[PDB]
């Protein structure tokens with residue numbers, strides 16, 4: 594059986610960790626669950642939840658909160674690679690395998706669909722799943738993060754860009770491989786790259802989802818949907834909020850209105866763009882700015898007692914705003930969970946440290962240690978009480994997994 598099993602260690606290829614540890618991912622999922630159950634149940638939550646992008650990061654945390662905080666039956670959709678012999682699957686695959694296992698232990702429904710959520714096919718499989726099992730869903734979480742989209746009608750492949758708009762920008766960053774503070778310049782996005790980014794990360798596909806569920810009649814009265822967004826501090830504004838990715842996020846703000854209008858006449862349902870804080874994710878070393886900003890932010894927020902990851906954010910988002918008696922609303926009608934990051938004193942401290950960090954003082958000025966630990970945690974590595982010396986079978990299976 595040693596030929597079918599292997600010792601799995603991190604392998605970092607060009608800022609991407611290309612391995613994932615199944616036992617560690619299970620431990621990470623369990624830790625997120627134990628957080629939710631320790632904090633306690635959430636009153637008045639949805640009971641039948643569809644999460645689009647349910648295998649990692651914020652969508653995973655939404656699934657865990659819905660299931661183990663609100664007691665929801667959950668249907669998840671994601672796009673992940675199964676493990677095979679000699680070849681660890683993606684962290685999201687192992688995460689979902691662990692979710693299904695823990696859901697069943699607690700007697701909660703868990704079914705998942707692995708495939709392209711941008712396609713009509715997957716929307717159909719999802720509809721069919723709800724009809725057979727749930728009747729309808731009360732809540733739809735939209736949490737896809739993707740670099741590309743195949744348009745379901747036209748077949749066109751759109752690619753997102755992470756560029757400023759207008760002028761080129763100098764962005765200070767941390768190269769996590771060489772452990773050097775260094776700057777690079779990004780050229781402004783072309784109108785074409787802006788439209789492509791809005792096609793991928795804007796709100797059309799979210800619309801196509803809520804319309805497809807409606808046209809099939811699988812949405813309960815008083816239903817609710819939310820898509821996640823990031824606004825960030827002024828230091829991220831040039832590249833994020835006012836760049837190509839921010840153009841996409843602003844498209845979401847123009848989608849959420851037609852969404853809310855349709856659900857509000859439908860038993861007083863509701864729809865909101867929800868704004869969340871920056872966290873370490875699979876794509877954090879997309880641009881070396883993110884690791885530097887996270888390392889700084891983690892240190893500052895830890896000194897204030899306010900540091901959080903995905904599960905802490907989404908638990909509050911559900912308890913305070915999605916299901917709570919005091920929604921934390923902004924001037925635009927967005928739900929906000931990100932205010933501890935945007936606190937003026939935090940921004941100021943992060944901004945002051947930003948111009949001071951050098952190769953020599955990274956560990957004295959920042960929580961780069963913490964960034965690295967959370968980044969490895971995502972793939973199931975560096976976790977407490979996991980025996981990393983033991984052989985493991987990378988081919989972990991998932992019951993009630995529809996493969997599309």
Ligand SMILES: NC(=O)C1=CN([C@@H]2O[C@H](COP(=O)(O)OP(=O)(O)OC[C@H]3O[C@@H](n4cnc5c(N)ncnc54)[C@H](O)[C@@H]3O)[C@@H](O)[C@H]2O)C=CC1
Pocket residue numbers: 645646647648649650651652670671672673685708709710711735736737738739821822823868869870871872873874875876
């Ligand atoms: N990571 C961060 O600091 C923040 C992210 N957000 C927003 O939260 C949302 C979730 O992002 P993360 O948690 O970072 O992403 P992530 O990479 O952890 O997860 C994205 C999910 O999308 C799924 N997915 C990607 N392409 C898909 C496809 N074609 N079809 C089906 N599933 C697909 C992945 O399987 C995964 O379940 C995004 O809208 C992001 O912009 C909001 C605030 C900050």
Ligand SMILES: CCCCCCc1ccn(Cc2cccc(N)c2C)c(=O)c1
Pocket residue numbers: 738739740753755822823825829833838870871872874876879882883884886
């Ligand atoms: C400089 C770091 C500040 C940005 C951190 C918050 C953040 C981090 C990741 N993402 C997802 C994302 C951001 C940028 C490019 C791409 N492709 C994707 C999927 C967000 O939307 C938001």
Ligand code: NA
Pocket residue numbers: 646647648649650651652653736737738
């Ligand atoms: Na997600």
